[PDB]
Design a protein around this nucleic acid. Structure first.
Ligand SMILES: Nc1ccc2ccccc2n1
Ligand SMILES: [Mg+2]
Ligand SMILES: [Mg+2]
Lengths: 834, 100, 200, 334
RNA sequence: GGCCAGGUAGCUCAGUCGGUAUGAGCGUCCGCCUGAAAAGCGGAAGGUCGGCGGUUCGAUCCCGCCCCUGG
C-alpha cells in the first residue's frame, strides 16, 4: 500500500540532469535514503549473467509431437551466418519475435551453467530465456519477448536488458506522498547531496502544448472535492504500434506490466511525475463529461469487468450513456482503450484524498492511482503531466496531439496552488534539535525542498511548495531541517527529570504477589484477552451469568473467538492443556492481568474537538463509556503438587492447594482473608470456597467441577483460584509488638462439632472467649472415629497462654480455656470431648 | 459394528435393504445409550451438590511463618525512596580508620 | 487512541494500522494499538512537568509467527517540560539502551513518521554481545510530541516541549537473549519460563 | 543507576528465606565469652584470629565476630528458652576478619586530599569485612497439624537453605562432604560455586550442642556472599513441539558416591537428548550388597526436530550408563 | 479476491474419492519382570478424520455454507 519500486538507472538519470555525472553505489544510496527517512525494504540487483547471452530472433518453429506439452524446435538467428537450433517448451512466441538466448558456456543467475543437451531426440544449442531465469522479472510461464525494434540479433543480452541495474523497494511514509515518483525521490536525493535539481515536471522539461480551444464539454460538481480536471486528446494512434523496450522495461522494474501504448504512457508518466493519468477511448464517450457524486444504488463496471456497488460519497466520471470512471480509483470498461482504439482523451485530475481513500477501501481497490491520490497529488503539475502524456503517446503510437485543452481549476479558477505561508523563528530548529546549526542552515534547507523563504528581522516566512501539503506548522519545517542535516549530529543529553515518587502501592503489591507465587512453585504465563470458543457453555454457566456479558471484537484473528476475557481462568486453563498435552502433566500456572467486564451495551462517544483540551466533564463521559477493567490474579494446578523423590511418591493436587494459593496472595498483600464454602461454577460445589477480605468478596478457589473437567478436556482433579486484586484494599500496617518476658502455659482443647462446622469458626470462637491471654492457637487433629457420632468430628487445638505482666497458674489458663469452651458451645455448638 | 463392516462383502443389490436393517439397529442402541449417558451424568452432577463437602477453612500452610526484620524493611523502604529520586546506595566498613 | 494523538481522519496514516474494533461497527471503541493513548490520559490528569513511562499490553492484527505476535507488550515514554529538545530524547534513549544491552550499547536515530510526533524517528541499537552479528536492528519509534497533541490536552506549545518513545518488550527480549521462536514467548509452555529461574 | 547487582541480590536472598519460613534477626558483632572454646576449635583456627575491642560493654565479650553463627545461635537460645522451640532464624550482615595484627596508620594532612596510595594504605590497614549470610534451625521444621505430626529439623533442611540462597543468587552450587567444626563431620557439607569454596552447612556437632546449651539436632548455614560472583544469565530456550520419551534407569554405586555425581555422569553421557532427570528411589539391602546402594532416575528424552523411537532414547540411556560406569563406577542394576 | 493443496489419536505425521483409519512413531493402560521401576517381550484402551447442514438405507470420503493455515 506504501511501496515504491524503481530502478536506480532511472533514478540516477533524473538526478543527473541537474548534476551531471552523479553516481553512487547501491550501498551508499541505501544509507542516504535511510538517513533522510526513506525506509529501504529491499535492494535487488538484476542478473547477473555471464558468457554468451545474446539477443536472437526466432526464424522458424517446428512442433515436436508425441509428448505431454507442446515442445518447439526453433531455429534462432543470433546475428551470424549459422542459425542455432534451440529446444523450448514455451508457447508465448511466434516466428519473427525477438528473444534472449543463453548459449552453451553462459551462466544464468543461480550458478546455472548452460550447455548443449540431448533433449526430446534433438540437440539444444542453448535455451530461450524467461524473465525469471534472467533475474529480470517474475514471469516464468513463457519466455521473454522483446518488442520489435528493441535490438538487432546478436546484441549483448545484458546490455539490452540492462542487467547491471538495481531496483529499490521503498516503503514511503503516508506523509511523503510526493516521494511516490521519480520526481520526488530525485528531489530528495538532490537535497541530501546538495545538488542542483531540474524538475522533470517543469515547463523546461515538459514544454507546454498549444491551447487553442476546449477539448471536451465538461461539468464538475464542486462539492465532490475535485481540485483540477484536465483533458487533452491524441488522435490517429496506430493500433499496431507497441511501446519501445526502454519504456516497457522501466514499467517492469517498477512492478507494472505493459499492455498497450496508450495505457503504457499513462502508467509511465505516473511513475515519473507522481500524477496519475488515464486514457479514455474518446470515440466511446457520448456527450458531456460529468464529475458528480454517485447516486443511491448506482453501480459501475471497471476496467477489470467487475461491477462495483457505489456509495453516495463516491465521485464518478459520467457521460450521457454510462459511467466513465470511479474518480481517482479506476476507470470504467465503457471508455477503456483496447486494440482498435484510434483517438484517445487523456484525463489529468486531482481528487479529494479523503474521498478516494474512503471509496478505495470500501471497494477494496488500492490501485496505483488510488494510493497516490489519498496521499495528495501535486495539483500544479496536472497540465504538465497531461502534455507529457500527449507528446509521448503521439511519439510512440504515431498519432497527432490536438491543440485543444480543457482545464477546470475550480470556481473561481485557481492559478496559485501554494499552501498558506508559515512564520517561524530562525532559531526554532536549533532549539528543538539542541544543536547550533551554522548561519543560514534553516533557510537553506527550506529553500531546498522547494519553499519560498523571506526574512523579516529574526522571523522567517515560509511558503511550502504545492507538492508538500504536509508542511502546515513550524514543527513540520523543523523536521525538514533536522532530517537533511542528519539526526546523528544531535548530541546525547540527559533530561532534567525531577524527584519522583517511584512505584505505587498497587504496582509494588503485584511484584510481591508474582514473587511469592513463583517462589511457591508456580509458573507465570501471559493470558490472552480473547476467550476460547464457547468456553462458558463448557463451564455450564447460566444464560444470565455476569461473566457472559462480554465485549466483542469486530475483526478478530479467529472469527470463532471475538469476545474479551471476563475472567483469567480460560486463558490459564488453555495454557494448562498445552503443557499437560506435551508431557508436562504436573503443572501450576498463575497470571496477573486485567479483565474486561462491560457494564452496558457497547456505546461510543462522538468526536470531541481536538483544537482544545476536553473539559473534566467530557473526560468523565469517555471513562464512563468504557467497560470496567479490574486487575485480577488467578492460578490453576493439576497433576502432582509435590514432586516425587527419595522422600516419597509425591502428593497429587487437591483443593487445599488452591486455598493455600489464596493465603499466599493474601500474605503478599498484607491483608487477612476468610474462606467460606460457596457454590460457584466452574468449581466443585463441595470443594469451593469464596474468598472474603473483611465483608467484601474478592474471589473463589478450590477444585473445579468434574463435569466441567470432562467437557473441557482438563486433567482430573484440576484446581483453580481467581481473585479480584482491585477489590482488595491496599494496606500498610504499622505493628507495635511488645514481647512479654514471662513464661507461657501450654494446653490442648478437644471439641466435638458437627461435620459441617468450619474449623476456622471453632478457632474464632475459642479465640473470642479466651481473651487477651491467648497468644497462639493451632489446630493439629481432626478425628472422625467411631467414638465420635456420625456427621460429627473432633477437633483438638494447641493453645498457648501468656500474660504480659505476670506468671500464670494452671487455673489461670484453665479459666480462659473454660471461657473459650463456653464460647465455642454458644457459637458453633461445640461439646467438650468426653 | 461388525454387522456394519459385513455389508461391504454383501452383493451390491443386497446392501441396500440389509443396510437399512443395520442402521435401524444401530440407531436403536445409540439412542438408548444417549439417554442413559444423560441420566447418569445428571445423577453425577446431583451427587456432588449434596455430598463431597470438604472443610474449606482447614489449615493449608505447611510452611512455618517467616519474616524479615522491620529495621531491614524500613531501610529497604528508605532506600527505595531515594533511588526513586535519582540517588544511589553507598557502602562502608563497620571497622573504620580514625582518619575517616 | 487516534484523534487526540493527531491521527488524521480517512487518511492512510490512520487506516494503514489495522486495529481490533469493538462491535458494533462504527462504535469508536477499540483495543489499543500502542501505549500512546496513555500520553493523553497522563497530560490531562497530572501537573507539569511530566516524566512517566507506561508498560502494558498492545493489540495489532498480525498473525503469530516466529517474529510477530498479535498481542504484545510495549513500554511507552512521555516527558513534557520547559525546554526539552531532541538531545534530551537522545539522552534518554541512550541511557535506556545502556541498561538493557550493556555499557557497549550505542544507538542511532533515523527520520521516520508518526502522526503524533514531529520530528519523528526510529531507534536502532548496537551492543558488543550481538547474537546475530554486530549490526543496526530496529528497536522502537520516538520523536517530539506534536504541538497539536499538546493543544488537545491544554498545554501551551510555546512554553512546554516534550519527547516520547515506544518499544516492544517482546521484540526487545528476542534480540537481547537470542530467542528463536516468539510463539514460545506467549504460548505459556513451562519449558520456556523455567530456564529463566524464579526471578525477583 | 538504582541498586547495584549485589544489593539487589541481598534483597532476593532475604525475601526467599523469609518466604521459606526463616525469621531475620540483627546479629551483634561482639562474640560471646569463649564461644570458640565451646565449639572446640583449634588454636590456629582462622576464625580465632579476631579483632578485639579496647572498651567493650562486657569485659568478657571484647572480640568481634569472624562468623555470624555465634550471634544467631545466641538468638536461637533466647527463643527456645522462652517457649519458641520450633525456630528458624537467619541474618545477612558483614563479619570482620583481620589478616594481621591491628596496625594503625598515622595522621594524614586534612588540608588536602590523600593520594590514591594513601587511600589504599588506609584500606589495607583494616580487617577484611566481607558480607555473610547465615541461618540456624532447631525443633520442628514443618509444624504439625491436620496433615500429620510434623517433621523435625534435619541436616537436609540446612542444605535446602543453601539451594534457596543459590536460586536467589542465580548461581549453581555443589555440595561435598567435609569435616569442619562446629558441624557434625558426618552431617556437614562444604558449599562450592564453580571451584570456589563459599561456606559450610548441615547439622552441628553433638558435643558443640551439649556445651553451648543448644537444642539437640541444631543445624546451621554460613555462606560468604562476597565469594559468590554475580551473574545475569540470558537464557534462550527453544520449546520442541515433538513428543518426549520417558525412561527409568537403576544404577548401583558405592555408598560414599554422592547421588549428584551419578546424576551429573548420566547427564554427561545422555547428551543433548536428555531433557530432564530426577532421582526418586534410594534402595539398600542384601539384594544390592554391603556398603552399596541402588539409585533409580526418571529420564525424559526429547529431540528438537523429530519424534524419537525407543531405540533412540535407549541409545542415549546406554551412553549415560557407560558414562556413570567410568565416572562413579556405577553398575547397571540386574 | 482466484482455482487449488491442507485441518486425521495426547504429541509429530501417514492414509483413504460410501459400509475395518487391520494407521505409524512417541504418549496412556495391562501382564511377565523388579523391593519399587524402566527397557525388553507380549497385549489392550483412546479419533465421534475442523464445524453446521444436505445427498444417501449408511458419509473422514460426494455437495453446499462457515471457521482455521501455506502457495
Ligand atoms: N507506542 C509508541 C510507538 C511509536 C511511538 C513513536 C513516537 C512516540 C511514541 C511512540 N509510542
Ligand atoms: Mg514532516
Ligand atoms: Mg494433530
Amino acid at each position: 500500500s506504501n511501496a515504491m519500486r524503481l530502478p536506480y538507472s532511472w533514478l540516477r538519470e533524473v538526478v543527473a540532469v541537474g548534476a551531471s555525472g552523479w553516481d553512487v553505489t547501491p550501498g551508499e544510496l541505501e544509507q542516504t535514503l535511510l538517513r533522510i527517512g526513506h525506509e529501504v525494504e529491499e535492494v535487488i540487483p538484476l542478473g547477473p549473467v555471464d558468457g554468451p547471452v545474446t539477443v536472437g530472433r526466432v526464424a522458424d518453429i517446428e512442433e515436436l509431437t508425441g509428448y505431454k506439452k507442446p515442445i518447439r524446435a526453433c531455429a534462432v538467428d543470433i546475428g551470424d551466418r549459422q542459425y542455432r537450433e534451440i529446444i523450448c517448451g514455451a508457447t508465448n512466441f511466434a516466428v519473427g519475435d525477438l528473444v534472449v538466448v543463453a548459449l552453451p558456456g553462459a551462466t544464468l543467475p543461480g550458478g546455472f551453467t548452460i550447455s548443449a543437451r540431448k533433449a526430446y531426440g534433438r540437440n539444444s544449442d542453448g535455451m530461450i530465456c524467461s524473465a525469471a531465469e534472467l533475474n529480470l522479472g517474475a514471469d516464468h510461464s513463457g519466455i521473454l519477448v522483446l518488442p520489435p525494434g528493441a535490438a538487432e540479433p546478436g546484441a549483448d543480452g545484458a546490455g539490452v536488458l540492462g542487467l547491471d541495474d538495481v531496483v529499490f523497494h521503498l516503503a514511503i511514509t503516508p506523509d511523503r506522498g510526493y516521494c511516490m515518483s521519480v520526481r520526488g525521490l530525485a528531489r530528495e536525493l538532490a537535497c541530501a547531496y546538495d545538488l542542483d535539481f531540474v524538475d522533470p515536471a517543469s515547463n523546461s522539461r515538459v514544454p507546454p502544448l498549444p491551447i487553442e480551444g476546449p477539448a471536451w464539454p465538461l461539468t464538475v460538481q464542486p462539492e465532490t472535492g475535485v481540485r483540477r480536471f484536465a483533458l487533452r486528446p491524441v488522435i490517429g494512434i496506430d493500433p499496431a504500434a507497441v511501446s519501445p523496450w526502454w519504456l516497457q522495461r522501466r514499467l517492469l522494474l517498477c512492478g507494472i506490466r505493459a499492455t498497450c501504448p496508450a495505457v503504457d504512457v499513462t502508467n509511465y508518466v505516473m511513475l515519473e511525475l507522481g500524477h496519475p493519468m488515464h486514457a479514455h477511448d474518446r470515440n466511446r464517450i457520448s456527450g458531456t463529461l460529468g464529475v458528480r457524486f454517485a447516486r443511491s444504488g448506482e453501480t459501475a463496471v471497471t476496467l477489470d469487468g467487475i461491477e462495483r456497488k457505489l456509495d453516495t460519497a463516491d465521485v464518478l466520471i459520467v457521460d450521457d450513456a454510462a459511467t466513465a470512471a470511479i474518480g481517482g480509483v479506476m476507470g470504467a470498461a465503457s471508455t477503456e482503450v483496447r486494440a482498435d482504439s484510434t483517438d484517445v482523451l487523456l484525463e489529468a485530475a486531482i481528487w479529494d484524498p479523503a474521498a478516494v481513500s474512503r471509496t478505495q477501501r470500501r471497494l477494496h481497490l488500492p490501485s496505483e492511482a488510488a494510493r497516490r491520490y489519498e496521499r495528495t497529488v501535486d495539483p500544479a503539475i496536472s497540465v504538465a503531466a497531461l502534455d507529457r502524456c500527449a507528446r509521448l503517446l503521439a511519439d510512440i503510437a504515431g498519432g497527432e496531439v490536438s491543440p485543444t485543452l480543457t482545464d477546470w481549476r475550480g470556481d473561481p479558477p485557481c492559478d496559485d496552488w501554494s499552501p498558506p505561508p508559515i512564520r517561524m523563528g530562525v532559531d526554532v530548529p536549533d532549539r528543538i534539535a539542541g544543536v547550533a546549526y551554522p548561519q543560514g542552515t534553516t533557510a537553506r534547507r527550506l529553500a531546498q525542498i522547494g519553499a519560498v523563504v523571506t526574512h523579516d528581522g529574526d522571523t522567517l516566512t515560509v511558503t511550502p511548495p504545492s507538492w508538500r501539503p504536509d508542511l502546515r506548522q513550524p514543527a513540520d519545517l523543523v523536521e525538514e531541517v533536522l532530517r537533511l542535516e542528519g539526526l546523528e549530529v544531535i548530541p546525547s543529553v540527559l533530561p532534567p527529570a525531577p524527584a519522583g515518587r517511584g512505584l505505587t502501592a498497587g504496582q509494588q503489591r503485584r511484584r510481591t504477589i508474582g514473587r511469592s507465587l513463583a517462589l511457591s512453585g508456580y509458573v507465570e504465563i501471559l493470558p490472552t484477552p480473547f476467550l476460547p470458543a464457547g468456553v462458558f457453555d463448557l463451564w455450564g454457566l447460566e444464560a444470565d451469568d455476569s461473566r457472559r456479558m462480554t465485549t466483542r471484537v469486530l475483526n478478530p484473528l479467529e472469527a470463532d473467538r471475538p469476545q474479551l476475557a471476563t475472567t483469567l481462568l480460560p486463558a490459564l486453563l488453555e495454557a494448562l492443556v498445552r503443557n499437560v498435552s506435551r508431557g508436562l502433566v504436573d503443572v501450576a500456572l498463575f497470571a496477573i492481568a486485567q479483565v474486561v467486564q462491560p457494564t452496558e451495551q457497547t456505546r461510543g462517544v462522538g468526536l470531541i474537538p481536538v483544537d482544545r483540551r476536553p473539559t473534566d466533564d467530557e473526560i468523565a463521559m469517555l471513562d464512563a463509556s468504557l467497560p470496567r477493567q479490574p486487575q485480577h490474579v488467578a492460578a490453576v494446578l493439576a497433576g502432582l503438587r509435590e514432586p516425587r523423590g527419595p522422600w516419597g511418591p509425591g502428593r497429587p493436587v487437591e483443593a487445599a492447594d488452591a486455598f493455600e494459593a489464596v493465603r499466599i496472595i493474601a500474605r503478599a498483600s498484607r491483608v487477612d482473608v476468610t474462606l467460606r464454602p460457596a457454590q460457584y461454577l466452574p468449581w466443585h460445589p463441595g470443594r469451593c470456597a469464596q474468598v472474603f477480605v473483611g465483608e467484601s468478596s474478592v474471589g473463589h478457589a478450590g477444585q473445579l467441577h468434574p463435569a466441567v473437567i470432562e467437557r473441557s478436556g482438563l486433567p482430573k482433579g484440576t484446581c483453580a483460584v481467581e481473585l479480584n486484586l482491585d477489590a482488595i484494599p491496599c494496606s500498610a500496617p504499622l505493628p507495635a509488638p511488645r514481647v512479654s518476658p514471662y513464661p507461657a502455659v501450654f494446653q490442648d482443647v478437644s471439641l466435638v462439632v458437627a461435620a459441617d462446622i468450619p474449623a476456622q469458626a471453632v478457632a474464632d470462637a475459642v479465640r473470642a472467649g479466651a481473651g487477651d491471654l491467648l497468644e497462639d492457637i493451632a489446630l493439629f487433629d481432626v478425628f472422625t472415629g467411631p467414638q465420635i457420632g456420625e456427621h460429627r468430628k473432633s477437633l483438638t487445638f494447641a493453645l498457648r497462654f501468656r500474660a504480659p505482666d505476670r506468671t500464670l497458674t494452671e487455673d489461670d489458663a484453665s479459666a480462659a480455656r473454660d471461657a473459650a469452651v463456653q464460647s465455642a458451645a454458644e457459637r458453633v455448638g461445640a461439646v467438650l470431648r468426653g | 459394528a461388525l454387522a456394519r463392516q459385513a455389508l461391504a462383502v454383501l452383493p451390491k443389490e443386497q446392501r441396500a435393504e440389509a443396510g437399512k436393517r443395520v442402521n435401524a439397529a444401530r440407531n436403536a442402541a445409540q439412542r438408548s445409550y444417549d439417554e442413559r449417558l444423560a441420566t447418569l451424568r445428571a445423577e453425577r452432577d446431583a451427587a456432588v451438590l449434596v455430598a463431597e463437602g470438604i472443610d474449606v477453612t482447614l489449615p493449608s500452610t505447611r510452611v512455618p511463618a517467616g519474616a524479615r526484620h522491620p529495621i531491614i524493611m524500613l531501610a529497604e523502604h528508605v532506600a527505595d525512596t531515594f533511588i526513586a529520586m535519582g540517588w544511589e546506595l553507598a557502602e562502608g566498613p563497620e571497622v573504620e580508620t580514625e582518619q575517616f | 487512541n487516534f484523534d487526540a494523538l493527531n491521527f488524521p481522519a480517512d487518511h492512510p496514516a490512520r487506516g494503514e494500522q489495522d486495529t481490533f474494533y469493538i462491535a458494533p461497527e462504527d462504535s469508536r471503541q477499540l483495543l489499543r494499538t500502542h501505549t500512546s493513548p496513555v500520553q493523553i490520559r497522563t497530560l490531562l490528569a497530572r501537573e507539569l512537568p511530566v516524566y512517566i513511562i507506561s508498560i502494558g499490553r498492545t493489540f495489532r492484527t498480525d498473525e503469530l509467527d516466529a517474529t510477530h505476535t498479535p498481542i504484545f507488550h510495549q513500554v511507552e515514554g512521555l516527558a513534557v517540560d520547559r525546554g526539552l529538545s531532541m538531545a534530551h530524547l537522545r539522552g534518554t534513549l541512550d541511557a535506556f539502551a545502556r541498561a538493557e544491552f550493556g555499557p557497549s550499547a550505542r544507538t542511532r536515530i533515523r527520520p521516520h513518521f508518526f502522526p503524533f510526533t514531529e520530528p519523528s524517528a526510529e531507534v536502532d541499537v548496537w551492543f558488543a554481545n550481538k547474537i546475530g552479528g554486530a549490526a543496526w536492528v530496529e528497536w522502537g519509534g520516538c520523536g517530539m510530541v506534536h504541538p497539536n497533541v499538546l493543544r488537545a490536552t491544554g498545554i501551551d506549545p510555546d512554553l512546554y516541549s516534550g519527547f516520547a518513545f515506544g518499544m516492544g518488550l517482546e521484540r526487545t527480549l528476542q534480540f537481547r537473549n537470542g530467542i528463536p521462536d516468539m510463539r514460545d514467548m506467549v504460548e505459556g509452555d513451562v519449558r520456556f519460563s523455567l530456564p529463566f529461574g524464579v526471578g525477583a
